[PDB]
Design a protein around this ligand. Structure first.
Ligand SMILES: COc1cc(-c2[o+]c3cc(O)cc(O)c3cc2O)cc(O)c1O
Length: 446
């Protein structure tokens, strides 16, 4: 009997949502080299992943519309392009299915999609095939989508520091930690935010939900709570497959520089690539790094070099690196790095906690505030920067706290404890090992 298994993959075709899903498909394609995997992206998303890379032959790439008609120029906000792609609907997706079916001569037996591509659930129901949701976001934020009415009711009536005790295992979460887009109603409501607010209804219809995180790092009551809301909640280790990482050159010379510093002494700063912070904070971050005296690697926009204080990069050159790019995963896995100043992106948090590096947190939007709260009040592996925004005096006090002071010994100790938990979790007898195989069997019997 010939193998007729054919998995259709629908990523959220944007930046940070692309590597973690290809990473999962790579592992799946390796353990099941007889099963066909059809990765369906846009021209820009496919150019992003598959340009340099070489992939196993049972993975095939197909192209659909980005939702941006030719001639049109999207505005400089990170939401429009997401909206335009989401507006393509299930018909654009089914076009990707057509390309897959025509190439493999196999009908689709299973679909794996990023949870945001909620239209792929519609496709899965039409084909009568199981729908598997991939969650590359902050894991703890899954619970929010099943209590939107309560969250909205509390965020309006109650104080901003009021706790969300109705969230099992996440009582530490506050009103001010809630993503703004699930509070926005009316004109400020986007197709992207309408999609995200549909998750509490969309997610339970999934055969399985695959969380790109370590099951042992989430509050047990949260995990249990989500298992009550979903048909299946699976965790698969977010650490890269050997096929994922691309051999890249240390052009800036970050690593060799880090070897010249002593253990846990360097501050690594990178506040995202999606949202640019207000120039006054950029000035404040620069001012704080200089006043502090600590060695630092600052991954900064090339376009933000002009708003930096005059002479800053030059006066700090003998103890600091201001660069356009860093091999972040390698930088965070270096012993010299003592603190990670982050916007709290799901991937950045993953990379920091798995390397025992404590974090100074300044969340900008989305689930980054959920991440920040967990880092500070739950895992206790870092702090939100004083005042929730970057200031010269506040950020220096955060740097001092984590890097050198005895008051931050608990946090540095917890950073090491969590790393050990991750190292054990990615082990052969961790949860994900059992869960990864559950996923393979779902695909096998699809
Ligand atoms: C990488 O592409 C983007 C992702 C996101 C994004 O927004 C979220 C918002 C939330 O409220 C909650 C989330 O979990 C998000 C995750 C994202 O990746 C937002 C953008 O403006 C983007 O451009």
């Amino acid at each position: 009997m010939k193998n007729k298994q054919h998995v259709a993959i629908f990523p959220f075709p944007f930046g940070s949502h692309l590597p973690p899903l290809l990473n999962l498909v790579l592992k799946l394609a390796h353990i099941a080299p007889n099963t066909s995997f059809s990765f369906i992206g846009t021209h820009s998303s496919n150019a992003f992943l598959f340009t340099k890379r070489h992939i196993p032959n049972n993975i095939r790439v197909f192209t659909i519309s980005d939702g941006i008609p030719e001639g049109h120029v999207p505005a400089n906000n990170p939401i429009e392009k997401l909206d335009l792609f989401l507006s393509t609907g299930p018909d654009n997706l089914r076009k990707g299915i057509e390309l897959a079916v025509a190439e493999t001569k196999q009908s689709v037996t299973c679909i794996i999609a990023d949870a945001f591509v909620t239209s792929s659930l519609l496709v899965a129901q039409t084909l009568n095939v199981p729908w598997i949701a991939f969650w590359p976001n902050v894991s703890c934020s899954l619970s929010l989508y099943f209590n939107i009415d309560l969250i909205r009711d509390k965020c309006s009536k109650d104080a901003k520091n009021a706790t969300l005790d109705f969230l099992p295992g996440l009582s530490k979460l506050r009103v001010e930690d809630v993503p703004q887009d699930m509070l926005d109603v009316g004109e400020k409501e986007t197709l992207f935010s309408r999609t995200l607010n549909s998750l509490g209804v969309v997610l339970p219809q999934a055969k399985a939900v695959v969380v790109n995180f370590f099951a042992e790092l989430d509050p047990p009551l949260f995990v249990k709570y989500m298992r009550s809301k979903l048909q299946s909640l699976l965790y698969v280790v977010p650490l890269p497959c050997p096929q994922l990482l691309l051999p890249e050159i240390d052009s800036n010379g970050c690593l060799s520089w880090l070897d010249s510093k002593s253990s846990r002494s360097v501050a690594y700063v990178c506040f995202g690539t999606v949202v640019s912070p207000p120039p006054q904070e950029v000035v404040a971050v620069a001012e704080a790094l200089e006043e502090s005296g600590f060695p630092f690697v600052w991954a900064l926009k090339e376009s933000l070099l002009s708003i930096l204080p005059k002479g800053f990069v030059e006066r700090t050159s003998t103890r600091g690196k201001v660069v356009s790019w860093v091999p972040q995963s390698h930088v965070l896995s270096h012993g010299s790095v003592g603190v990670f100043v982050t916007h709290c992106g799901a991937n950045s948090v993953m990379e920091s906690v798995s390397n025992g590096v404590p974090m100074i947190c300044r969340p900008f939007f989305g689930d980054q505030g959920i991440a920040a709260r967990v880092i500070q009040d739950i895992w206790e592996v870092g702090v939100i920067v004083e005042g929730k925004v970057f200031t010269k005096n506040g950020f220096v006090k955060s740097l001092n706290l984590i890097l050198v002071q005895e008051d931050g010994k608990k946090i540095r100790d917890n950073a090491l404890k969590v790393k050990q938990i991750v190292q054990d979790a990615v082990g052969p007898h961790g949860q994900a090992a059992e869960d990864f195989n559950t996923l393979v069997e779902v695909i096998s019997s699809s």
